[PDB]
From Swiss-Prot:
Acts as a negative regulator of entry into mitosis (G2 to M transition) by phosphorylation of the CDK1 kinase specifically when CDK1 is complexed to cyclins. Mediates phosphorylation of CDK1 predominantly on 'Thr-14'. Also involved in Golgi fragmentation. May be involved in phosphorylation of CDK1 on 'Tyr-15' to a lesser degree, however tyrosine kinase activity is unclear and may be indirect. Changing N158A: Loss of kinase activity. GO terms for cellular component: cytoplasm; cytosol; endoplasmic reticulum; endoplasmic reticulum membrane; Golgi apparatus; Golgi membrane; membrane; nucleolus. The modification Phosphoserine is found at S15, S41, S64, S81. Belongs to the protein kinase superfamily. Ser/Thr protein kinase family. WEE1 subfamily. Its EC number is 2.7.11.1. It comes from the Eukaryota. Mg(2+) 2 binds at G173. Coiled coil: none annotated. The gene is PKMYT1. Keywords: Acetylation, ATP-binding, Cell cycle, Endoplasmic reticulum, Golgi apparatus, Kinase, Magnesium, Membrane, Metal-binding, Nucleotide-binding, Phosphoprotein, Serine/threonine-protein kinase, Transferase. ATP binds at L37, G38, H39, G40, S41, Y42, G43, E44, V45, K60. It is found in: Endoplasmic reticulum membrane; Golgi apparatus membrane. This is Membrane-associated tyrosine- and threonine-specific cdc2-inhibitory kinase.
Amino acid sequence: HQLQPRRVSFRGLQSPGYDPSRPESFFQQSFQRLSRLGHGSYGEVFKVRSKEDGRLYAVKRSMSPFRGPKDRARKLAEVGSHEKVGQHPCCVRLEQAWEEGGILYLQTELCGPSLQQHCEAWASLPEAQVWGYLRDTLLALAHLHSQGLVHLDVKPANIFLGPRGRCKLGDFGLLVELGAGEVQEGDPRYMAPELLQGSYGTAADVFSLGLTILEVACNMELPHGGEGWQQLRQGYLPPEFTAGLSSELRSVLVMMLEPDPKLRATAEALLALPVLRQ
Ligand SMILES: Cc1ccc(O)c(C)c1-c1cc(-c2ccnc(N3CC[C@@H](N)C3)c2)cc(C(N)=O)c1N
Protein backbone atom coordinates (compact mmCIF):
# COMPACT_ATOMS: atom_id res chain seq x y z
CA HIS A 1 0.00 0.00 0.00
CA GLN A 2 0.99 3.61 -0.68
CA LEU A 3 0.31 6.71 1.42
CA GLN A 4 -1.86 9.43 -0.18
CA PRO A 5 -0.08 12.44 -1.70
CA ARG A 6 0.68 15.18 0.80
CA ARG A 7 0.83 18.92 0.01
CA VAL A 8 4.23 20.43 0.70
CA SER A 9 4.14 23.98 2.07
CA PHE A 10 6.01 25.96 4.68
CA ARG A 11 3.23 28.50 5.23
CA GLY A 12 0.37 26.78 7.09
CA LEU A 13 -4.01 16.76 -1.16
CA GLN A 14 -7.42 16.71 -2.82
CA SER A 15 -8.54 18.05 -6.17
CA PRO A 16 -11.42 17.65 -8.68
CA GLY A 17 -10.80 14.47 -10.66
CA TYR A 18 -8.39 12.91 -8.16
CA ASP A 19 -9.66 9.70 -6.59
CA PRO A 20 -7.59 8.27 -3.67
CA SER A 21 -9.40 4.93 -4.17
CA ARG A 22 -7.80 4.54 -7.59
CA PRO A 23 -4.25 3.13 -7.63
CA GLU A 24 -2.41 5.62 -9.86
CA SER A 25 -0.68 8.78 -8.66
CA PHE A 26 -2.02 12.27 -8.18
CA PHE A 27 0.28 13.32 -11.03
CA GLN A 28 -1.11 10.60 -13.36
CA GLN A 29 -4.75 11.30 -12.43
CA SER A 30 -4.76 15.13 -12.24
CA PHE A 31 -2.71 16.02 -15.33
CA GLN A 32 -2.34 15.21 -18.96
CA ARG A 33 1.35 14.92 -19.86
CA LEU A 34 1.99 16.82 -23.10
CA SER A 35 5.78 16.90 -23.59
CA ARG A 36 9.03 16.63 -21.67
CA LEU A 37 10.82 19.96 -21.26
CA GLY A 38 13.89 18.70 -19.48
CA HIS A 39 15.54 15.76 -17.77
CA GLY A 40 18.67 15.45 -15.65
CA SER A 41 19.81 14.16 -12.27
CA TYR A 42 17.43 16.78 -10.83
CA GLY A 43 14.59 14.73 -12.31
CA GLU A 44 12.23 15.69 -15.09
CA VAL A 45 10.11 18.64 -16.16
CA PHE A 46 6.88 18.11 -18.10
CA LYS A 47 4.50 20.44 -19.90
CA VAL A 48 1.04 19.40 -18.66
CA ARG A 49 -2.61 20.35 -18.78
CA SER A 50 -4.43 20.41 -15.45
CA LYS A 51 -7.65 18.44 -15.05
CA GLU A 52 -8.67 20.82 -12.28
CA ASP A 53 -8.84 24.01 -14.36
CA GLY A 54 -7.93 22.98 -17.92
CA ARG A 55 -4.91 25.27 -18.10
CA LEU A 56 -1.29 24.61 -19.08
CA TYR A 57 1.43 24.29 -16.41
CA ALA A 58 4.88 22.84 -15.92
CA VAL A 59 5.61 20.11 -13.37
CA LYS A 60 9.03 19.16 -12.08
CA ARG A 61 9.37 15.83 -10.35
CA SER A 62 12.40 14.44 -8.61
CA MET A 63 14.15 11.42 -10.12
CA SER A 64 14.35 8.99 -7.19
CA PRO A 65 12.60 8.47 -3.85
CA PHE A 66 13.96 10.22 -0.75
CA ARG A 67 16.91 8.27 0.70
CA GLY A 68 16.44 9.41 4.29
CA PRO A 69 14.92 12.22 6.42
CA LYS A 70 17.73 14.72 5.63
CA ASP A 71 17.55 14.09 1.89
CA ARG A 72 13.80 14.66 2.11
CA ALA A 73 14.25 17.84 4.20
CA ARG A 74 16.74 19.24 1.69
CA LYS A 75 14.56 18.52 -1.32
CA LEU A 76 11.42 19.95 0.29
CA ALA A 77 13.36 23.11 1.20
CA GLU A 78 13.14 24.21 -2.44
CA VAL A 79 9.39 24.64 -1.97
CA GLY A 80 9.92 26.85 1.09
CA SER A 81 12.38 29.01 -0.86
CA HIS A 82 10.02 29.22 -3.84
CA GLU A 83 7.14 30.16 -1.57
CA LYS A 84 9.27 33.01 -0.18
CA VAL A 85 9.51 34.37 -3.75
CA GLY A 86 5.72 34.30 -4.18
CA GLN A 87 3.97 36.10 -7.05
CA HIS A 88 5.96 38.48 -9.24
CA PRO A 89 5.65 38.96 -13.03
CA CYS A 90 9.40 38.32 -13.51
CA CYS A 91 9.64 35.22 -11.31
CA VAL A 92 8.42 31.71 -12.12
CA ARG A 93 5.28 31.28 -10.01
CA LEU A 94 4.72 28.14 -7.93
CA GLU A 95 1.12 26.92 -8.03
CA GLN A 96 1.41 23.97 -5.61
CA ALA A 97 3.81 21.22 -4.56
CA TRP A 98 3.25 17.74 -3.18
CA GLU A 99 5.03 14.54 -2.29
CA GLU A 100 3.89 11.05 -3.22
CA GLY A 101 5.78 7.78 -3.21
CA GLY A 102 8.90 9.59 -1.97
CA ILE A 103 8.85 11.86 -5.05
CA LEU A 104 8.62 15.65 -4.86
CA TYR A 105 6.51 17.51 -7.43
CA LEU A 106 6.49 21.27 -8.09
CA GLN A 107 3.77 22.62 -10.30
CA THR A 108 4.41 26.07 -11.72
CA GLU A 109 3.09 28.35 -14.42
CA LEU A 110 4.21 27.22 -17.90
CA CYS A 111 7.00 29.35 -19.34
CA GLY A 112 8.74 29.35 -22.71
CA PRO A 113 12.31 28.25 -23.56
CA SER A 114 15.19 29.23 -21.36
CA LEU A 115 17.46 32.02 -22.53
CA GLN A 116 20.05 29.31 -23.09
CA GLN A 117 17.76 27.43 -25.49
CA HIS A 118 16.62 30.67 -27.11
CA CYS A 119 20.24 31.58 -27.86
CA GLU A 120 21.14 28.14 -29.15
CA ALA A 121 18.34 28.21 -31.70
CA TRP A 122 18.66 31.82 -32.81
CA ALA A 123 23.72 33.16 -32.97
CA SER A 124 23.82 36.59 -31.27
CA LEU A 125 20.50 38.15 -30.27
CA PRO A 126 19.17 41.56 -31.41
CA GLU A 127 20.17 43.99 -28.67
CA ALA A 128 16.62 45.27 -28.23
CA GLN A 129 15.71 41.80 -26.92
CA VAL A 130 18.75 41.65 -24.64
CA TRP A 131 17.76 44.96 -23.03
CA GLY A 132 14.33 43.45 -22.27
CA TYR A 133 15.84 40.34 -20.68
CA LEU A 134 18.21 42.45 -18.61
CA ARG A 135 15.41 44.73 -17.40
CA ASP A 136 13.01 41.90 -16.50
CA THR A 137 15.63 39.90 -14.66
CA LEU A 138 16.72 43.06 -12.81
CA LEU A 139 13.08 43.45 -11.65
CA ALA A 140 13.26 39.85 -10.43
CA LEU A 141 16.45 40.58 -8.46
CA ALA A 142 14.98 43.73 -6.89
CA HIS A 143 12.04 41.58 -5.85
CA LEU A 144 14.26 38.82 -4.39
CA HIS A 145 16.41 41.27 -2.50
CA SER A 146 13.27 42.90 -1.02
CA GLN A 147 12.47 39.50 0.43
CA GLY A 148 16.01 39.23 1.82
CA LEU A 149 16.81 36.56 -0.78
CA VAL A 150 19.81 35.95 -3.02
CA HIS A 151 19.77 33.67 -6.07
CA LEU A 152 23.12 32.01 -6.19
CA ASP A 153 22.75 30.56 -9.69
CA VAL A 154 21.56 33.21 -12.12
CA LYS A 155 22.46 31.91 -15.58
CA PRO A 156 20.91 31.62 -19.08
CA ALA A 157 19.44 28.19 -18.25
CA ASN A 158 17.47 29.60 -15.30
CA ILE A 159 15.73 32.45 -17.12
CA PHE A 160 12.61 31.61 -19.09
CA LEU A 161 10.98 33.48 -21.92
CA GLY A 162 7.48 34.60 -21.00
CA PRO A 163 4.88 36.48 -23.02
CA ARG A 164 5.98 39.13 -25.56
CA GLY A 165 9.71 39.54 -24.94
CA ARG A 166 9.36 39.08 -21.17
CA CYS A 167 11.89 37.01 -19.04
CA LYS A 168 11.15 35.16 -15.77
CA LEU A 169 13.82 34.03 -13.32
CA GLY A 170 13.39 30.52 -11.91
CA ASP A 171 14.99 27.53 -10.15
CA PHE A 172 14.94 28.72 -6.58
CA GLY A 173 16.71 25.64 -5.28
CA LEU A 174 19.87 27.76 -4.87
CA LEU A 175 18.21 30.71 -3.22
CA VAL A 176 19.66 31.76 0.15
CA GLU A 177 18.18 34.07 2.75
CA LEU A 178 20.13 37.02 4.20
CA GLY A 179 21.36 31.88 8.75
CA ALA A 180 22.02 31.29 5.04
CA GLY A 181 20.83 27.69 4.82
CA GLU A 182 22.25 24.75 2.86
CA VAL A 183 23.05 25.34 -0.82
CA GLN A 184 24.67 23.65 -3.85
CA GLU A 185 27.47 24.89 -6.12
CA GLY A 186 26.48 27.64 -8.61
CA ASP A 187 27.91 27.57 -12.16
CA PRO A 188 31.47 28.89 -11.93
CA ARG A 189 31.18 30.73 -15.25
CA TYR A 190 28.81 33.28 -13.71
CA MET A 191 30.03 33.30 -10.13
CA ALA A 192 30.76 36.62 -8.37
CA PRO A 193 34.40 36.75 -7.27
CA GLU A 194 33.57 37.29 -3.58
CA LEU A 195 31.87 33.83 -3.44
CA LEU A 196 35.32 32.24 -3.59
CA GLN A 197 35.67 33.42 0.01
CA GLY A 198 32.13 32.35 0.82
CA SER A 199 30.96 35.96 0.94
CA TYR A 200 27.54 36.64 -0.47
CA GLY A 201 24.89 39.30 -0.52
CA THR A 202 22.48 40.98 -2.89
CA ALA A 203 25.38 42.06 -5.04
CA ALA A 204 26.33 38.49 -6.01
CA ASP A 205 23.18 38.12 -8.19
CA VAL A 206 23.80 41.34 -9.98
CA PHE A 207 27.28 40.16 -10.98
CA SER A 208 25.93 36.81 -12.21
CA LEU A 209 23.22 38.57 -14.23
CA GLY A 210 25.92 40.76 -15.75
CA LEU A 211 27.84 37.74 -17.09
CA THR A 212 24.57 36.04 -18.06
CA ILE A 213 23.65 38.97 -20.24
CA LEU A 214 27.21 39.34 -21.50
CA GLU A 215 27.13 35.73 -22.63
CA VAL A 216 23.78 35.90 -24.42
CA ALA A 217 24.63 39.23 -26.04
CA CYS A 218 28.01 38.10 -27.46
CA ASN A 219 27.17 34.39 -27.99
CA MET A 220 30.53 33.15 -26.67
CA GLU A 221 31.34 30.62 -23.95
CA LEU A 222 32.59 32.18 -20.71
CA PRO A 223 35.61 30.58 -19.00
CA HIS A 224 34.95 28.27 -16.05
CA GLY A 225 38.35 28.98 -14.48
CA GLY A 226 41.97 29.95 -15.11
CA GLU A 227 43.26 33.25 -16.42
CA GLY A 228 40.17 33.96 -18.54
CA TRP A 229 37.97 33.63 -15.47
CA GLN A 230 40.12 36.08 -13.52
CA GLN A 231 40.21 38.59 -16.38
CA LEU A 232 36.40 38.87 -16.38
CA ARG A 233 36.65 39.87 -12.72
CA GLN A 234 38.99 42.87 -12.93
CA GLY A 235 36.52 45.65 -13.64
CA TYR A 236 36.80 45.85 -17.42
CA LEU A 237 35.29 43.97 -20.36
CA PRO A 238 37.80 41.95 -22.32
CA PRO A 239 37.56 42.95 -26.03
CA GLU A 240 37.16 39.23 -26.86
CA PHE A 241 33.55 39.47 -25.61
CA THR A 242 32.52 42.94 -26.74
CA ALA A 243 32.50 42.74 -30.52
CA GLY A 244 29.18 44.12 -31.69
CA LEU A 245 28.05 45.26 -28.25
CA SER A 246 26.72 48.81 -28.18
CA SER A 247 28.49 51.39 -26.04
CA GLU A 248 25.27 51.65 -24.01
CA LEU A 249 25.13 47.97 -23.18
CA ARG A 250 28.83 47.78 -22.43
CA SER A 251 28.60 50.56 -19.85
CA VAL A 252 25.72 48.97 -17.97
CA LEU A 253 27.47 45.59 -17.97
CA VAL A 254 30.66 47.11 -16.53
CA MET A 255 28.58 48.60 -13.69
CA MET A 256 27.26 45.12 -12.94
CA LEU A 257 30.67 43.46 -13.16
CA GLU A 258 32.45 45.62 -10.57
CA PRO A 259 34.58 43.11 -8.58
CA ASP A 260 34.15 44.88 -5.24
CA PRO A 261 30.64 44.03 -4.15
CA LYS A 262 30.45 47.19 -1.99
CA LEU A 263 30.93 49.27 -5.12
CA ARG A 264 28.79 47.17 -7.47
CA ALA A 265 25.53 48.77 -8.70
CA THR A 266 22.32 47.60 -7.00
CA ALA A 267 19.41 46.25 -9.03
CA GLU A 268 17.36 49.31 -8.13
CA ALA A 269 20.16 51.67 -9.13
CA LEU A 270 20.41 49.96 -12.51
CA LEU A 271 16.63 50.05 -12.97
CA ALA A 272 16.72 53.83 -12.31
CA LEU A 273 19.04 54.46 -15.30
CA PRO A 274 17.39 56.33 -18.20
CA VAL A 275 18.44 53.49 -20.51
CA LEU A 276 16.34 51.01 -18.54
CA ARG A 277 13.25 53.20 -18.16
CA GLN A 278 9.85 51.60 -18.81
C1 LIG B 1 8.64 23.03 -13.27
C2 LIG B 1 9.50 24.07 -12.50
C3 LIG B 1 9.43 24.11 -11.14
C4 LIG B 1 10.20 25.05 -10.41
C5 LIG B 1 11.04 25.95 -11.11
O1 LIG B 1 11.80 26.91 -10.36
C6 LIG B 1 11.10 25.92 -12.48
C7 LIG B 1 11.99 26.90 -13.21
C8 LIG B 1 10.33 24.99 -13.20
C9 LIG B 1 10.49 24.93 -14.71
C10 LIG B 1 11.67 24.30 -15.18
C11 LIG B 1 11.88 24.19 -16.58
C12 LIG B 1 13.16 23.55 -17.10
C13 LIG B 1 13.26 22.97 -18.35
C14 LIG B 1 14.50 22.43 -18.76
N1 LIG B 1 15.55 22.52 -17.96
C15 LIG B 1 15.51 23.10 -16.78
N2 LIG B 1 16.72 23.18 -15.96
C16 LIG B 1 17.93 22.85 -16.34
C17 LIG B 1 18.70 22.71 -15.00
C18 LIG B 1 17.88 23.56 -13.99
N3 LIG B 1 18.75 24.59 -13.31
C19 LIG B 1 16.95 24.16 -14.69
C20 LIG B 1 14.32 23.65 -16.28
C21 LIG B 1 10.97 24.73 -17.47
C22 LIG B 1 9.84 25.38 -16.99
C23 LIG B 1 8.82 25.98 -17.99
N4 LIG B 1 9.24 26.15 -19.32
O2 LIG B 1 7.67 26.30 -17.65
C24 LIG B 1 9.60 25.49 -15.59
N5 LIG B 1 8.44 26.13 -15.14
